[model samples]
Target chain A: MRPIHPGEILREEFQKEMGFSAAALARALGVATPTVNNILRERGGVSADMALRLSICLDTTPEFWLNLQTAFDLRTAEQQHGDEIIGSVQRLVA
Target chain B: NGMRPIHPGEILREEFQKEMGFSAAALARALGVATPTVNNILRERGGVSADMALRLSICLDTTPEFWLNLQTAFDLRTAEQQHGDEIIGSVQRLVA
Candidate 1:
């Protein structure tokens, strides 16, 4: 299954549940409006720093965000570069 | 949380020096990154990027997920260490 973007969760679930405007969340999170918007639109990622702020504002942890990002990123990366990545393996850990 | 997760670079160091007995210079040339880049990562000063993960996987015969997971674990710990005190509420609840 495809990993969903964390931004989509932030927008459709948390932001909506909290009734927070984009500007409001930006202010509360002490980030620029565009940062939140960019993530929401799936044009950006929930980076570590952003995750810290987000966990504070919401009821989550940085790993929650980071894990989501890792899953999403790993999925996208696998899709984009699967065969080449698989073929190039020099397996140490097995 | 028990002990720091093993740094990817630590494994790389083992692979390059301890096991393979390759010098940093040799590994750097092999990995196609700067010597300092290899040194920095081995010394745990920075991290491996996705591009670097690919480079490392190809060079060392490891998977990108191996490198990516290590970087992610290290980065997450650093985030908590640096900002854990400040984000008290969230941190406490998380630990709970």
Candidate 2:
């Protein structure tokens, strides 16, 4: 299975456009600094609450973060489709 | 009663890490969960299962019941929001 494309680029772009550091954003969002950093680095994804907070902070929509996460999950799932098929078949046929 | 938020994954992850001294990859392997799934749990982005709780309890010398209780609390709180009565109550309470 391949590593799926990540939204790190979009996150980075958003961060840059917003002109806020991870620490600053974390403070604003009342979350841990590492959490914000992780999301920006694509080491983590946004939660529903976090997405809403980010939307309010960035003057965007929570749907944007949700859509991005959905896209990322779909792409990652597609990349792992080969392993998923093999595992499914092994479970059923083997 | 007002909402009582409990982050079980955060508590479990911190406690497990402190008790077992295991890396994310090691814990994932032992728990039979994906590394990303394990990461998500550790980061408070996902949850643990009874099976995982059992494995963790064995490895860390903790009680599965502890994890089970935490899971139950989290599940109950989250599920409460799905109740139609609570949903309507929240909306009305918001306006009132």
Candidate 3:
């Protein structure tokens, strides 16, 4: 799941099953087309606001989107900067 | 009556000086951050970042959840005050 980008899930599962276009989902969710496109295209992750709106339109809960995004964020952060974060800080426990 | 959240910055500043007696430079060195980053949190210029949370957790011997929870409460209160009406509209809370 960490290696799988969120956009693919939306594309292959929700959007495909529901037969909704990016623009249609955007207007229905009261978000911009670019937001829908970004999420679908793997260019960006869903935000808290977007996740809520998505839950309204989709069959899933807001927690699902948030959890998925959180996983993605942690994976990305660890890949990009985990060393820097874990490195410079001292360990008080030991 | 609704309660208010005390910005974590206040507690941080109190700890930064009163509990720890850390000058900004010293605090930065201790926390592995730059001086302005210490000053930023101390002055309430912004919420703390994730890396800062990890650093604080290590130095203060608290979990990252501790600092992040503080940010969540402070941020939720602030966000609700500013965006209450819009945010209050049609959000779901699933109970099953």
Candidate 4:
């Protein structure tokens, strides 16, 4: 499993300050409770339509999500590449 | 296809949560979502919705625009991805 990062921290924080339950959020958003759960736990992702609704609710900018994703992608890519290199080196030694 | 982006409100939600030192399970309970889903958002793996954003704003004492920005980012990225695939024949060609 990939290590949790700062982005995850942000998500958890958002939910906390909101003072609503995941189930309530799901009901309010008209989506399955599990879907909201998945997003909160990092099991899934935010979608385009969902983002729009969230933007309306949060009063922030959409770019914030995009930027966070960018940061995550960069970190993920780096980790993957590093893992790949490590794997190749181990294979060569074996 | 073009890459997808995250939402701004999503970011704010995350930051707010962090500032408050809340956990995914706690947030999930508050938002009425599953613990896992909340975890996904924290990891930047999930998206937010307009309605959800509104609820979040109300709950968090923020503005709706925050959520809207995140929504716009998601819409633009989705559109870009669809458009890119159409232009590149990736959608049809792969299936054909």
Residue B61 of model 1, lDDT score: 73
Q: Candidate 1, residues A1-94: lDDT per residue as tens digits?
A: 6868999888888877777788888777776899889998999888777788788778787778877787777777767776665564433422
Return the lDDT, model 4, position A66: 53
**Global lDDT scores for all candidate models:** 0.74, 0.56, 0.67, 0.53
Per-residue C-alpha lDDT of model 4 across residues B48-69, encoded as one tens digit per residue: 6434444455456665456655
Error of 3 at A11 (Å): 5.1
**lDDT (0-100) at residue A33 of candidate 4?**
76
The CAPRI class of candidate 1 is acceptable
Instruction: Specify the poorest-scoring 10-residue window by lDDT in model 1 chain B.
Output: B87-96
Q: Candidate 1 — what's its lDDT?
A: 0.74
- Tell me the spans in candidate 1 whose CA falls farther than 4 Å from its real position: A92-94, B1-7, B14-17, B20-40, B51-66, B83-96
For residues A26-92, could you state the per-residue lDDT of candidate 3 as single tens digits? 7777767998899899998766566656666675765576556555655565567678877887643
Q: After superposition on all CA atoms, what RMSD does each candidate show versus the true structure?
A: 4.7, 13.1, 4.7, 19.8
**Candidate 1 C-alpha lDDT tens digits along B1-95:** 33575678887876556877777777777666688988898897878876678778777876767887788777767666776566554322111
Q: Model 4, range A1-94, lDDT digits (tens) per residue?
A: 3645433643566666666677666655556778777767776555544544444445544455555544444345446554442332211110
Interface root-mean-square deviation of model 1 in angstroms is 6.0
B1-87 per-residue lDDT for model 3 (tens digits): 146865667777775467766676776776788888888888888776656776776776776556655665665556556654574
Better of 1 and 3 by lDDT: 1
Off by over 4 Å in 2: A1-10, A86-94, B1-96
When sorted by lDDT, best at the front, the candidate numbers are 1, 3, 2, 4
lDDT of 2 by residue, B55-76 (tens): 5555455665566556555654
User: Which pairs clash inside model 3?
Assistant: none
